[PDB]
Paper text:
Human alpha-2 macroglobulin-like 1 (A2ML1) is a monomeric member of the A2M superfamily (A2MF) of protease inhibitors and complement factors. The functional inhibitory unit of A2ML1 is a monomer that depends on covalent binding of the protease (mediated by A2ML1’s thioester) to achieve inhibition. A2MF protease inhibitors utilize a unique trapping mechanism that pseudo-inhibits proteases regardless of their catalytic class. Trapped proteases remain catalytically active but are prevented from cleaving protein substrates through steric hindrance imposed by the inhibitor following a proteolytically triggered conformational change.
Author numbering: 20 to 263, 277 to 633, 670 to 695, 730 to 1177, 1186 to 1454
Write the structure that this text describes.
């Protein structure tokens, strides 16, 4: 009786092909054997064949049918042998699926400080590691506040991968940002928080996890710097053990190596019983002498058992009856440590008997074993292998040690053949690509076999589910019963699994089967063979290195070169050729996959675990089983398309560090596949490391200490040689060795000192010059070693030498507007008699139009510290208004578009921290409960008009309108929660009509229609007070809300109201609440409201423009300094007005000829073209400040400004704010290096109003001083302080409402650099929205 075999793969994946195989016995030869599959949509023939006179094995590849009715479905594979009126038919239910393509997100770091650009890559792969070029529809980047802040649409992948960039804000939120891919199918999370660790790290080396067989131990508490340097200090070490707390404390001092050894004995703690905790903690507190700071180290040690657990990792699920089965057992203790000469007990349970036997192990922990199944006689048996007779002990009060017995159950190799085929496994991990040689012996039983035929072995090499290789070996069966062996040749790729299989079966044409499979263990390899090599991988920081990258031809690769501690932070979250695996292989265990068809619930028991869809006609019918250091910037993050040669050599420059760089790469190719490289290291080694401690802030005429500490790194004695370049910008006194070389040996430090005084101003560079020289004298009994590289170092560090006194700026903006004629203007700028010498500068700015001064200074505008929600919008909202001007006039080029939108997500990220859990936007954020409704209207207006430029989430605008629904009165008007606004035009108590006007005008400007219900409801509120209003700011804003809509009959009424209170200041008219050009604050924004109400007529009127250019002629001369309109809200309202005027009165501006003239016969020419209208034209005036002459000719309306800055010994005010300070503590006889002196500041508002709007007290620091560490917390603990900010030389403290009462704020400062002859330092308090109401005093130090 001849027999046949049909084999198909189990899972039928869509984008690739599979393989079908047919095995036919000698005999038949007239019977057509065919395989075909039937689906619900189509049917194709897989294979037709006819029998031969020999044993044949035919295998062909086939493409799967497309899936229908979803992704997962079940087809029917159908085998027919037809002939001699005999039909062998079957029907087997087989599963066909569209598999899930694997994908991952690779970020640049798992941890970023704020202010760094995040880079990431998105990679999609199939199950065979070929890249997928399916287009990503929409990808997003979200904050820790679950709010999307970036979004890319319709992004295409380049060879399956795509890279993206996102610049974070300098003030960014803290938490895990999330990159979401394809509506949230893929998440990549990276943490962003600000970590700076200047404290020296205290570590251990020899303390590790301990066992119970330890009676004594040595603890090496070693305290070292972040770059790595020992110091001398006293260490107290508490080694404690908790209770379900036996502790011992010791004290010592570290040596010159910095590692202190202490004997810790286990007998002082709980070691036998488990009534106490199983974890022992070491707390080391280090106090350095002369510092007083305490460094804390916590190290936990868990008590580990001596032995681990046994699992039958390499054990077959069957047994050969009446014939021996051999194998090996790997024995190891705890955490995969091999135990030499360990003892293993194995017991069999069955009907024959529960026999026990014992085995000894070798030094490698691999013990061979043989088992004889002569007496079992086809019965179900159980295997139990353990270490000893001891088992698990259960106790609710004590945590037991982990133990797991090696238990298995075996069921009866179901056949009619008693021949034997050998089992030959080869070691642990295997290699890929090399032809592996394996030998497997066999045996032939003469009773069930005939010597006339020839023997044949058919083997299937199966990996990643489907069968990969096949083959046949025909040998002579005339030798009959012997222990012969046959050879095999094996090629392994990534198509083979990490745990693939090889099955051999021999089948006789007279009758009988014998089968055996071997499970392998291959290292997770790839079709793409990549190599990330370095030259020379020991390079000095500063010189370029050669990176060689090898892959398959036609590949796209991606580098990630970063610090080693970035890899040491997270053991996971990197590509380590296990992360790219894992999601794919889960086909183990169960033979069907959502298929209810079974055979007897053996060949079925063989092909249950790793096998295929296999059917035959042999004996198969039997019931069987059916179941910690810093994180610097990253070195490389680049993309590289490599050529057909497969090599890519790139010269890349190392960063200036002392650390060791690690690089990781992956390569993607459509022809071959994916390839991942291990992390290959490059050490950046420098011989000597210097550290220049230098004060940022210093006043001229002071002195400070220049410091040039050199820390050795080589393990010998070197001769350093420090130098300072002599310059005329500073004078010096040599406290150092004065160009004398020293003997610095290994792990030894030296400190130099210089006394530096300053005679100039500005940024002054200090240049160090250190060099190991060729010594003529031996140091420490040995010759001074000269390294061949890194022999020199030239570090340059700057100082900011600010002048004494306070900076007073003076501006005189002009609006020469030539209507075909010559327009002239004189500028009068004068200096006081008490100016600080050589501190005066003057500069004239010429531009071709308006809305280009804001365009140059889109960042900034105000000179004020933007740390609140009402003031952040000078870096967000005039960008929207100037680009509305450039979009409605068609002058928006692409480069200013890209710069402005980059500033826009910077302002978006900075604004989004003032959002709440609700939709409202307060000023300071997360401390005010419910936010301000007016600022919510302002941010809703500038989010509605910015979503056509950048990506704004519509969810936060929708929550803003939900908060508008929450603040809608039944009278039709708009209310507010809390008392925190701008100047409020009189100090207004009601403010309801102006608030409702601004909310509804913001809704109309953002894009809502008149027939909108909130807009119509606010307008129905304002018909009540449409005419009867008195405040000029409220009248101009009310003329804006009635001029945005089409209520012209009362817009003309309000215009006639505004013509009564319009101050006719010559040819320029304007409006003011309380009636050289020094600007005021609220009159600028209310005449901006008047100008905005003028220019919102849809019908152009020539009489309207004649009044409008007079209002512009007043409004554009109030430009304070570089940005304009001194405060923040004044600036955004007046730039909105001037942008609306510039849209509604747009000019061609072909050419303007302008002459700047002065009294020193200094004249210069500016020429304005059409394209040259948006350049910030600048000239520093060399004249002594007096009068200047400005004339313009041509067609257009240009803007000219002149800014004068000088320094003044600051006079007091004593009429708006009363300000005083005094200095306590300060020692003056025991100064040391932390000269901690306190400052107590008494503030009050003695002005005319009931309360100031919002105040900034600006402690400009003394030279070389810092505000200690805890002053931020103890200033937030004091009342009426919302935010304290120390940028680089000033402490700005933000006050909510400063009043008639006197508030005392105290804070202590400590210097970092020693300073001598301290100049006085200023303290200034101003109203934020009225900066001219300021009070400036000065303080000093009573010692020097």
């Amino acid at each position: 009786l001849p027999n046949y075999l049909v084999t198909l793969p189990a899972r039928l994946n869509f984008p690739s092909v599979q393989k079908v195989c047919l095995d036919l016995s000698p005999g038949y030869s007239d019977v057509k054997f065919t395989v075909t599959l039937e689906t619900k949509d189509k049917t194709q023939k897989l294979l037709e064949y006819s029998g031969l006179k020999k044993r044949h094995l035919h295998c062909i590849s086939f493409l799967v049918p497309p899936p229908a009715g979803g992704t997962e479905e079940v087809a029917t594979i159908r085998v027919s042998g037809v002939g001699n009126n005999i039909s062998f038919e079957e029907k087997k239910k087989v599963l066909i699926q569209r598999q899930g393509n694997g994908t991952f997100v690779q970020t640049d770091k798992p941890l970023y400080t704020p202010g760094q650009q995040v880079y990431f890559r998105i990679v999609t792969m199939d199950s065979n590691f070929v890249p997928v070029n399916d287009k990503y529809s929409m990808v997003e980047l979200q904050d820790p506040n679950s709010n999307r802040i970036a979004q890319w649409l319709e992004v295409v992948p380049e060879q399956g991968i795509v890279d993206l960039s996102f610049q974070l804000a300098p003030e960014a939120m803290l938490g895990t940002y999330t990159v979401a891919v394809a509506e949230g199918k893929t998440f990549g999370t990276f943490s962003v928080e600000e970590y700076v660790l200047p404290k020296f790290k205290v570590e251990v080396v020899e303390p590790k996890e301990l066992s119970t067989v330890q009676e004594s131990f040595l603890v090496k508490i070693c305290c070292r710097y972040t770059y790595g340097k020992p110091m001398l200090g006293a260490v107290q070490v508490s080694v404690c053990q908790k209770a379900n707390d036996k502790c011992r404390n010791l004290s010592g001092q570290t040596d010159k190596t910095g590692c202190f050894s202490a004997p810790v004995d286990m007998a002082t703690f709980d070691l036998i019983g488990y009534a106490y905790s199983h974890q022992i903690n070491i707390v080391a507190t280090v106090v350095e002498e002369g510092t007083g700071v305490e460094a804390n180290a916590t190290q936990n040690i868990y008590i580990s058992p001596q032995m681990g657990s046994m699992t039958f990792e390499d054990t077959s699920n069957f047994y050969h009856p009446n014939f021996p089965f051999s194998g090996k057992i790997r024995v190891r203790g705890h955490d995969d440590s091999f135990l030499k000469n360990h003892l293993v007990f194995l017991v069999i349970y069955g009907t024959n008997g529960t026999f026990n036997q014992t085995l000894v192990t070798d030094n490698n922990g691999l013990a061979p074993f043989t088992l004889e199944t002569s007496g079992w006689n086809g019965t179900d048996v159980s295997l139990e292998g353990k270490f000893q007779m001891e088992d698990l002990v259960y106790n609710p009060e004590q945590v037991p040690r982990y133990y797991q017995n090696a238990y298995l159950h075996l069921r009866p190799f179901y056949s009619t053949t008693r021949s034997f085929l050998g089992i030959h496994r080869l070691n642990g991990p295997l290699k890929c690509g090399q032809p592996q040689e394996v030998l497997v012996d066999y045996y032939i039983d003469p009773a069930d076999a005939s010597p006339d035929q020839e023997i044949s072995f058919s083997y299937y090499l199966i990996g990643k589910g489907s069968l990969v290789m096949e083959g046949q070996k025909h040998l002579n069966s005339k030798k009959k019963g012997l222990k012969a062996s046959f050879s095999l040749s094996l090629t392994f790729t990534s198509r083979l699994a990490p745990d693939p299989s090889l099955v051999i079966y021999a089948i006789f044409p007279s009758g009988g089967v014998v089968a055996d499979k071997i499970q392998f263990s291959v290292e997770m390899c790839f079709d793409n063979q990549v190599s990330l090599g370095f030259s020379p991988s020991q390079q000095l920081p500063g010189a370029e290195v050669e990176l060689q990258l090898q892959a398959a031809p036609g590949s796209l690769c991606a580098l990630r070169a970063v610090d080693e501690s970035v890899l040491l932070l997270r053991p996971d979250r990197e590509l380590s050729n296990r992360s790219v695996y894992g999601m794919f292989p889960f086909w183990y265990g169960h033979y069907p996959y959502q298929v209810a068809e079974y055979d007897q619930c053996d060949l079925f028991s063989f092909f249950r675990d790793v096998g295929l869809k296999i059917l035959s006609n042999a004996k198969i019918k039997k019931p069987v089983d059916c179941s910690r250091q810093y994180f610097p910037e990253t070195w490389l993050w680049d993309l590289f398309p490599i050529g057909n040669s497969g090599k890519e050599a790139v010269h890349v420059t190392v960063p200036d560090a002392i650390t060791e760089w690690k690089a990781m790469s992956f390569c993607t190719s459509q022809s071959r596949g994916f390839g991942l490289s291990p992390t290959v290291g490059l050490t950046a080694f420098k011989p000597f490391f210097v550290d220049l401690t230098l004060p940022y802030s210093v006043v001229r005429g002071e002195s400070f200490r220049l410091t040039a500490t050199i820390f050795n790194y080589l393990k010998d004695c070197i001769r350093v040689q420090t130098d300072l370049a002599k310059s005329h910008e500073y004078q010096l006194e040599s406290w150092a060795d004065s160009q004398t070389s020293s003997c610095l040996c290994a792990d030894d430090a030296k400190t130099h000192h210089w006394n530096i005084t300053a005679v100039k101003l500005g940024h002054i560079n200090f240049t160090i010059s250190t060099k190991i020289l060729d010594s003529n004298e031996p140091c420490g009994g040995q010759k001074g070693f000269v390294p061949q590289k890194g022999r020199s170092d030239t570090l340059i560090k700057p100082v900011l030498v600010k002048p004494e006194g306070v900076l007073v700026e003076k501006t005189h903006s002009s609006l020469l507007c030539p209507k075909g004629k010559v327009a002239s203007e004189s500028v009068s700028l004068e200096l006081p008699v008490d100016i600080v010498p050589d501190s005066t500068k003057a500069y004239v700015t010429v531009l071709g139009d308006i809305m280009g001064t804001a365009l140059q200074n889109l960042d900034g505008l105000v000179q004020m510290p933007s740390g609140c929600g009402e003031q952040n919008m000078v870096l967000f909202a005039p960008i929207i208004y100037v680009l509305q001007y450039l979009e409605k006039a068609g002058l928006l080029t692409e480069e200013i578009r890209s710069r402005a939108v980059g500033f826009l997500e910077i302002g978006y990220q900075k604004e989004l921290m003032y959002k709440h859990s609700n939709g409202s936007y307060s000023a300071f954020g997360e401390r005010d409960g419910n936010g301000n409704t007016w600022l919510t209207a302002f941010v809703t207006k500038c989010f509605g008009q910015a979503q056509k430029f950048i990506f704004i989430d519509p969810k936060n605008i929708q929550d803003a309108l939900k908060w508008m629904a929450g603040n809608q009165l039944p009278s039709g008007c708009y209310a507010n929660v809390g008392n925190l606004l701008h100047t409020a035009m009189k100090g207004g108590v009601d403010d309801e009509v102006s608030l409702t006007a601004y909310v509804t005008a913001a809704l109309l400007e953002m894009g809502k229609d008149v027939d909108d219900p909130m807009v119509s409801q606010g307008l129905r509120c304002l018909k009540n007070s449409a005419t009867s209003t008195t405040n000029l700011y409220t009248q101009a804003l009310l003329a804006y809300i009635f001029s945005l809509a089409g209520e012209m009959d009362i817009r003309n009424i309000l215009l006639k109201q505004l013509d009564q209170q319009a101050i006719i200041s010559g040819e320029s008219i304007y409006w003011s609440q309380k009636p050289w050009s020094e600007p005021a604050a609220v009159d600028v924004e209310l005449t901006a409201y008047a100008l905005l109400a003028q220019l919102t007529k849809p019908s152009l009127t020539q009489k309207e423009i004649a009044k409008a250019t007079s209002i512009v002629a007043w409004l554009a001369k109030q430009h304070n300094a570089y940005g304009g309109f001194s405060s923040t809200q004044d600036t955004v309202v007046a730039l909105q007005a001037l942008a609306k005027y510039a849209t509604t009165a747009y000019m061609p501006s072909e050419e303007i000829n302008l002459v700047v003239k002065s009294t020193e016969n200094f004249q210069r020419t500016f020429n304005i073209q059409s394209v040259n209208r948006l350049v910030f034209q600048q000239d520093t005036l060399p004249n002594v400040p007096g009068m200047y002459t400005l004339e313009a000719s041509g067609q257009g309306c240009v803007y000219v400004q002149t800014v004068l800055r000088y320094n003044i010994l600051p006079p007091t005010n004593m009429k708006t704010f009363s300000l005083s300070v005094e200095i306590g503590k300060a020692r003056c006889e025991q100064p040391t290096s932390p000269r901690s002196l306190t400052l107590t500041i008494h503030t009050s508002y003695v002005g005319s109003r009931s309360s100031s709007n919002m105040a900034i007290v600006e402690v400009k620091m003394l030279s070389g001083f810092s505000p200690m560490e805890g002053t931020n917390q103890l200033l937030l603990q004091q009342p009426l302080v919302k935010k304290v900010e120390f940028g680089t030389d000033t402490l700005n403290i933000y006050l909510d409402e400063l009043i008639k009462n006197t508030q005392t704020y105290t804070f202590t400062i400590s210097q970092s650099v020693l300073v001598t002859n301290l100049k006085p330092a200023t303290i200034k308090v101003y109203d934020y929205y009225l900066p001219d109401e300021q009070a400036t005093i000065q303080y000093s130090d009573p010692c020097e």
